[PDB]
Amino acid sequence: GPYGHQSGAVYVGNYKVVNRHLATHVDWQNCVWEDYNRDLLVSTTTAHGCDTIARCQCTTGVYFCASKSKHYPVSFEGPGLVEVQESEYYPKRYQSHVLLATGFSEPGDAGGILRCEHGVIGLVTMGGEGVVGFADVRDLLWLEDDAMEQ
Numbered sequence: 001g002p003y004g005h006q007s008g009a010v011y012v013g014n015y016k017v018v019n020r021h022l023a024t025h026v027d028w029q030n031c032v033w034e035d036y037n038r039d040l041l042v043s044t045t046t047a048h049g050c051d052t053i054a055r056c057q058c059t060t061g062v063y064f065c066a067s068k069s070k071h072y073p074v075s076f077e078g079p080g081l082v083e084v085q086e087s088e089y090y091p092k093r094y095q096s097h098v099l100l101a102t103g104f105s106e107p108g109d110a111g112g113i114l115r116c117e118h119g120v121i122g123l124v125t126m127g128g129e130g131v132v133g134f135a136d137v138r139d140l141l142w143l144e145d146d147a148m149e150q
């Protein structure tokens with residue numbers, strides 16, 4: 001039957017951070033932290049994760065695309081508060097700690113998680129007419145080892 005695999009979230013050790021609109025009743029049931037402005041929350045799990053978050057701030061990284069189903073290297077900025085337009089299933093609200101990346105085409109809306117050569121940055125937050133909004137996990141790394149530059 002099935003074949004394609006996907007996580008749609010970031011599993012870190014005994015803490016799993018996923019998008020609020022993507023979290024399940026179980027995520028909130030055992031949720032330790034949750035930032036509305038970041039639309040992200042952290043829940044505890046028994047099974048160790050398989051992802052390593054990067055503690056870097058490189059302006060260049062690679063994001064995953066659902067349409068392309070491939071990894072896309074793109075440069076982005078880490079704007080604090082970004083007003084997300086009412087799209088998909090979210091109302092025009094303010095989001096904190098979101099990184100945006102302007103692609104070079106029309107496609108590119110959602111995907112998975114934004115990872116850098118050092119580690120994991122964040123998950124797909126909101127998107128624009130040609131930009132990629134990602135919720136950085138650099139504001140709540142308390143989950144596992146962090147990536148450094150030294």
Ligand SMILES: [Zn+2]
Nearest residue numbers: 056058116118
């Ligand atoms: Zn990096």
